[PDB]
């Protein structure tokens, strides 16, 4: 019987800021 008894929070600002490098890129590839 003793044996039986022995039984993410994500910052919207920092995503918006860190992605800025990349969001603007297609337009840069196309000049403006």
């Amino acid at each position: 019987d003793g044996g039986g008894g022995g039984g993410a929070t994500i910052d919207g600002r920092q995503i918006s800021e860190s992605t800025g490098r990349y969001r603007s890129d297609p337009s840069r590839r196309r000049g403006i």
Binding site: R23, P26, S27, R29, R30
Partner: protein
């Protein structure tokens, strides 16, 4: 498909997408690392850059 370029054509078969077709390549993207060749077929469109 390193020999492939935009404007070339290719046979594509995909089940269950239901396509068995010959398409123009509108773009190719090569990734090393994940080792993926990504074909854009028929036409390419942008998003906020359009």
């Amino acid at each position: 498909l390193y020999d492939a370029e935009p404007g070339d054509t290719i046979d594509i078969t995909i089940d269950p997408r239901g396509i068995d077709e010959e398409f123009v390549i509108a773009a190719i993207e090569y990734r090393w690392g994940v080792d993926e060749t990504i074909l854009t077929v028929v036409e390419k469109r942008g998003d906020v850059d359009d």
